[PDB]
Design an enzyme around this catalytic site. Structure first.
Site, PDB file in Angstrom:
ATOM      1  N   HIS A  41       0.796  -1.220   0.000  1.00  0.00           N
ATOM      2  CA  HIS A  41       0.000   0.000   0.000  1.00  0.00           C
ATOM      3  C   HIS A  41       0.837   1.282   0.000  1.00  0.00           C
ATOM      4  CE1 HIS A  41       0.385   0.068   4.497  1.00  0.00           C
ATOM      5  NE2 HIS A  41       0.254   1.370   4.312  1.00  0.00           N
ATOM      6  N   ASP A  86      -0.060  -7.641   1.844  1.00  0.00           N
ATOM      7  CA  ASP A  86       0.460  -6.283   1.836  1.00  0.00           C
ATOM      8  C   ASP A  86       1.985  -6.293   1.886  1.00  0.00           C
ATOM      9  OD1 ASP A  86       0.405  -3.532   1.771  1.00  0.00           O
ATOM     10  OD2 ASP A  86       0.063  -3.314   3.938  1.00  0.00           O
ATOM     11  N   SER A 180       4.283   3.198   7.782  1.00  0.00           N
ATOM     12  CA  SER A 180       3.991   2.104   6.854  1.00  0.00           C
ATOM     13  C   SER A 180       5.183   1.680   5.995  1.00  0.00           C
ATOM     14  CB  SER A 180       2.837   2.489   5.927  1.00  0.00           C
ATOM     15  OG  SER A 180       1.599   2.476   6.613  1.00  0.00           O
ATOM     16  N   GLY A 181       5.331   0.370   5.802  1.00  0.00           N
ATOM     17  CA  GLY A 181       6.418  -0.143   4.985  1.00  0.00           C
ATOM     18  C   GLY A 181       7.699  -0.456   5.729  1.00  0.00           C
TER      19      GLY A 181
HETATM   20  C1  LIG Z   1       3.382  12.193  -2.059  1.00  0.00           C
HETATM   21  O1  LIG Z   1       2.725  11.064  -1.484  1.00  0.00           O
HETATM   22  C2  LIG Z   1       1.721  11.455  -0.521  1.00  0.00           C
HETATM   23  C3  LIG Z   1       1.171  10.186   0.100  1.00  0.00           C
HETATM   24  O2  LIG Z   1       0.807   9.253  -0.936  1.00  0.00           O
HETATM   25  C4  LIG Z   1      -0.282   8.449  -0.573  1.00  0.00           C
HETATM   26  O3  LIG Z   1       0.013   7.606   0.543  1.00  0.00           O
HETATM   27  C5  LIG Z   1       1.079   6.652   0.314  1.00  0.00           C
HETATM   28  C6  LIG Z   1       1.272   5.879   1.604  1.00  0.00           C
HETATM   29  C7  LIG Z   1       0.732   5.744  -0.873  1.00  0.00           C
HETATM   30  O4  LIG Z   1      -0.386   4.930  -0.542  1.00  0.00           O
HETATM   31  C8  LIG Z   1       0.406   6.594  -2.106  1.00  0.00           C
HETATM   32  O5  LIG Z   1       0.003   5.758  -3.182  1.00  0.00           O
HETATM   33  C9  LIG Z   1      -0.708   7.591  -1.770  1.00  0.00           C
HETATM   34  O6  LIG Z   1      -0.962   8.425  -2.890  1.00  0.00           O
HETATM   35  C10 LIG Z   1       0.627  12.307  -1.185  1.00  0.00           C
HETATM   36  O7  LIG Z   1      -0.194  12.874  -0.148  1.00  0.00           O
HETATM   37  C11 LIG Z   1      -1.510  12.456  -0.062  1.00  0.00           C
HETATM   38  O8  LIG Z   1      -2.268  13.204  -1.024  1.00  0.00           O
HETATM   39  C12 LIG Z   1      -3.677  12.877  -1.009  1.00  0.00           C
HETATM   40  C13 LIG Z   1      -4.334  13.679  -2.119  1.00  0.00           C
HETATM   41  O9  LIG Z   1      -3.375  14.426  -2.855  1.00  0.00           O
HETATM   42  C14 LIG Z   1      -4.277  13.192   0.365  1.00  0.00           C
HETATM   43  O10 LIG Z   1      -5.649  12.827   0.387  1.00  0.00           O
HETATM   44  C15 LIG Z   1      -3.518  12.430   1.452  1.00  0.00           C
HETATM   45  O11 LIG Z   1      -4.009  12.814   2.730  1.00  0.00           O
HETATM   46  C16 LIG Z   1      -2.020  12.748   1.354  1.00  0.00           C
HETATM   47  N1  LIG Z   1      -1.246  11.989   2.325  1.00  0.00           N
HETATM   48  C17 LIG Z   1      -1.767  10.938   2.953  1.00  0.00           C
HETATM   49  C18 LIG Z   1      -2.195  11.138   4.399  1.00  0.00           C
HETATM   50  O12 LIG Z   1      -1.907   9.839   2.416  1.00  0.00           O
HETATM   51  C19 LIG Z   1       1.230  13.457  -2.012  1.00  0.00           C
HETATM   52  O13 LIG Z   1       0.213  14.044  -2.812  1.00  0.00           O
HETATM   53  C20 LIG Z   1       2.383  12.982  -2.906  1.00  0.00           C
HETATM   54  N2  LIG Z   1       3.045  14.123  -3.507  1.00  0.00           N
HETATM   55  C21 LIG Z   1       3.036  14.283  -4.826  1.00  0.00           C
HETATM   56  C22 LIG Z   1       3.374  15.665  -5.356  1.00  0.00           C
HETATM   57  O14 LIG Z   1       2.771  13.372  -5.610  1.00  0.00           O
END
Ligand SMILES: *[C@@H]1O[C@H](CO[C@@H]2O[C@@H](C)[C@@H](O)[C@@H](O)[C@@H]2O)[C@@H](O[C@@H]2O[C@H](CO)[C@@H](O)[C@H](O)[C@H]2NC(C)=O)[C@H](O)[C@H]1NC(C)=O
Length: 234
Positions: A41, A86, A180-181
């Site tokens: 994840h 996972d 995580s991870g």
């Molecule tokens: C950088 O990554 C973060 C986090 O990515 C998410 O969580 C990881 C654990 C993995 O599961 C990824 O595939 C996910 O996409 C991004 O931040 C999240 O952004 C979303 C919407 O933009 C938001 O709803 C979340 O709350 C954010 N973080 C959390 C708590 O997950 C961030 O957008 C990425 N940066 C770029 C520029 O790509």
């Protein structure tokens, strides 16, 4: 990580930081010169990995940046079940050499034993409710608990998932958002991968859930050998 303290700068040479331009978002474990193991994840379309890191503000001399050349998740994984298999294997775009703050951690040779003391680490939140991200990784010791404890606390945790349950009965020490991870190290063995938990973090009735690495070692080794067509145990 909550209920812990800053890690010793030399006790996490195998710890890998997953990040994108917004910041760190996951951890991983370097198991050999070209391979990193993390949670499925934690996968994203664009991310890089930082090796040999301790403080986000103060650079370590031997710090290295790497890219995911190839990524592998179980072919027989159900994408609608975040707790199903996972685990993800990542091949680096370039191998790394051992250095002061960089060294691989071998795959487990013996199964996990309930009651053993385990260590968790990561750059995740150090506060249970509010999200407080540290510049350095925090470490804590917890116990490997009977799987029944997590079973009672998580209705979504099905018996067929290959997981481990860890924390302390009264709560207070646990992984949190952002860990995580990362690796769960018991008796010096890489036994689990930070996979799932509850928020607020550290609730007594809801210990942390970790992926059982031991059960996937053969699958991992076949992928490293070149048989990237291998399937994971059901
Ligand atoms: C950088 O990554 C973060 C986090 O990515 C998410 O969580 C990881 C654990 C993995 O599961 C990824 O595939 C996910 O996409 C991004 O931040 C999240 O952004 C979303 C919407 O933009 C938001 O709803 C979340 O709350 C954010 N973080 C959390 C708590 O997950 C961030 O957008 C990425 N940066 C770029 C520029 O790509």
């Amino acid at each position: 990580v909550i209920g812990g303290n800053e890690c010793d700068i030399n006790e996490h040479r195998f710890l890998v930081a997953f990040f994108n331009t917004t910041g760190f978002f996951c951890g991983g474990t370097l198991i050999n010169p070209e391979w990193v193991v993390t949670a499925a994840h934690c996968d994203s379309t664009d991310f890089q990995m930082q090796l040999g890191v301790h403080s986000k503000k103060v650079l370590n001399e031997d710090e290295q940046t790497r890219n995911p050349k190839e990524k592998f998740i179980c072919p027989n994984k159900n994408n609608n079940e975040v707790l199903d298999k996972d685990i993800m294997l990542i091949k680096l775009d370039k191998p790394i050499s051992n250095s002061k703050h960089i060294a691989p951690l071998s795959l487990p040779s013996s199964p996990p034993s309930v009651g053993s003391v385990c260590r968790i680490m990561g750059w995740g939140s150090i506060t249970p409710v509010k999200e407080t991200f540290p510049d350095v990784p925090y470490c804590a010791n917890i116990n490997l608990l009977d799987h029944a404890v997590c079973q009672a606390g998580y209705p979504e945790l099905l018996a067929e998932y290959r997981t481990l349950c860890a924390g302390i009965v009264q709560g207070g020490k646990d992984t949190c958002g952002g860990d995580s991870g990362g690796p769960l190290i018991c008796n010096g063995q890489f036994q689990g991968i930070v996979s799932y938990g509850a928020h607020p973090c550290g609730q007594g009735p809801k210990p942390g859930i970790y992926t059982n690495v031991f059960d996937y070692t053969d699958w991992i080794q076949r992928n490293i050998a070149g048989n990237t067509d291998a399937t994971c145990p059901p």
